[PDB]
């Protein structure tokens, strides 16, 4: 019967050579599973959440990446709009410049209103065109009687060499009328027989500083709201890309190892089992 008793003994060593080498691997495993556990606590500490599983890690990260891309399009979109205003404003600001002061004085002299002020109200898209339109008549003074001037007309001496005057109701003024051919960024009026004026569209037109200055305020409001939202976004992004890179380090290095049962658990268990085997080889 020697065969059952001898072969039986083999199988116990056979196993013990397995438990021995099996344990040895768990020992290489430990130090790495240590570093792995550190990184996992740390990264899981960076945000209030609990990672029981590796799938949790992948889930928190799907969300992390949307937070990121969305924040990057908004911060980019905002700053785009911000710069579109930094620019806008710049344009409406440079002033030409300079209308004559004397005119203000004469319009005050004769009861009545300036035209720079009557049409100070006009729109931004229209303002440049209408300035070219009235030719040198832009700074005309509007007075309904034209009687005050005729009297004080002789008196005036220092007035600008050409003075333009128009009889109308400043409160409800009735637009002029021209023989005109509109050209790109310019206008061509037939002022008379065989005579024509070409006036370019100005940057900073006489007419419409009031609707203009008014837009320029609205742009400052918006700009400061943008720079405020931009600040919040760009921080938000930096913080997110910082947790992005957080996950990568961990993913590339410690992710496989973690979510394993501690090595020591099986190392001590296998050991009491190998001691049990050795005792049976002893008995």
d(CA 131, CA 43): 65
Rounded to 10 deg, the angle between the 209-253 and 54-93 helix axes is 160
Residue 79 vs 135, nearer CB to a copy of itself:
135
107-126 binders of ligand [N+] (CB under 6 A): 126
Residue 5: name its binding partner from ligand [N+], a copy of itself, none (Cβ under 5 to 8 Å by kind).
Answer: none
| CA–CA distance, 43 with 253 (Å, rounded to integer) | 13
**Residue of 16, 37, 104, 137 that binds a copy of itself (CB under 8 A):** 137
Say how far apart CA 164 and CA 142 lie, in whole Å.
9
| Residue 164 lies near a copy of itself (rule: CB under 8 A) | yes
Rounded CA separation 163/158 (Å): 11
Binding track, positions 35-74, relative to ligand [N+]; x by CB under 6 A: ----------------------------------------
Q: Which of 129, 134, 230, 250 binds ligand [N+] (CB under 6 A)?
A: 129
Cβ count near 276 (within 10 Å): 9
Sort 139 into a burial class: Cβ within 10 Å, 0-12 / 13-18 / 19+. Answer: buried
**C-alpha angle 82-84-89 in degrees, rounded to nearest 5:** 95
CA atoms of 80 and 251, how far apart (whole Å): 35
Tell me whether residue 48 or residue 97 sits nearer to a copy of itself (CB atom).
Answer: 97
Q: Could you give the CA distance from residue 119 to residue 128 in angstroms, rounded to a whole number?
A: 11
Q: Give the three-state DSSP class for 251.
A: helix
Binding mask 199-228 for a copy of itself (x = CB under 8 A): xx-x--------------------------
Strands 113-114 and 180-183, by their bridges, are unpaired
Indicate whether 151 belongs to the interface with a copy of itself (CB under 8 A): no
Give min distance, CB of 96 to a copy of itself, in A. Answer: 9
Choose between 85 and 149: whose C-beta lies nearer to a copy of itself.
Answer: 149
Comparing every residue's Cβ against ligand [N+], the nearest one is: 129
Which of 12, 73, 146, 225 is the binder for a copy of itself (CB under 8 A)? Answer: 146
What residues line the site for a copy of itself (CB under 8 A)? 132, 135-137, 140, 146, 149, 153-154, 156-157, 159, 161-168, 176, 183-184, 186, 188, 191-192, 194-200, 202
What residues line the site for ligand [N+] (CB under 6 A)? 126, 129
């Amino acid at each position: 019967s020697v065969s059952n008793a001898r072969e039986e003994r083999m199988a116990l060593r056979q196993e013990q050579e397995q438990l021995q080498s099996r344990i040895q691997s768990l020992m290489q495993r430990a130090p790495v599973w240590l570093a792995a556990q550190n990184s996992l606590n740390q990264l899981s500490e960076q945000c209030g959440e609990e990672f029981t599983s590796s799938q949790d890690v992948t889930e928190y990260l799907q969300q992390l990446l949307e937070r990121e891309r969305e924040a990057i399009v908004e911060r980019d979109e905002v700053g785009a709009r911000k710069n579109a205003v930094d620019e806008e404003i710049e344009r409406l600001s440079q002033p030409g410049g300079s209308e004559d002061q004397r005119l203000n004085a004469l319009a005050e002299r004769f009861g009545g209103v300036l035209l720079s002020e009557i049409y100070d109200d006009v729109s931004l898209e229209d303002a440049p065109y209408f300035s070219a339109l009235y030719g040198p008549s832009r700074h005309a003074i509007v007075v309904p009687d034209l009687s005050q001037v005729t009297e004080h007309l002789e008196g005036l001496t220092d007035c600008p060499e050409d003075l333009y005057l128009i009889e109308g109701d400043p409160q409800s003024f009735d637009d002029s009328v021209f023989s005109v051919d509109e050209l790109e960024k310019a206008v061509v009026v037939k002022i008379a027989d065989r005579q024509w004026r070409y006036s370019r569209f100005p940057e900073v037109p006489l007419f419409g500083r009031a609707a203009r200055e008014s837009r320029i305020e609205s742009l400052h409001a918006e700009r400061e709201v943008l720079s405020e939202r931009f600040a919040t976004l760009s921080f938000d992004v930096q913080k997110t890309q910082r947790l992005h890179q957080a996950f990568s380090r961990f993913i590339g290095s410690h992710l496989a190892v973690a979510f394993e049962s501690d090595p020591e658990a099986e190392i001590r268990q296998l050991n009491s089992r190998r001691v049990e085997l050795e005792r049976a080889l002893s008995n």
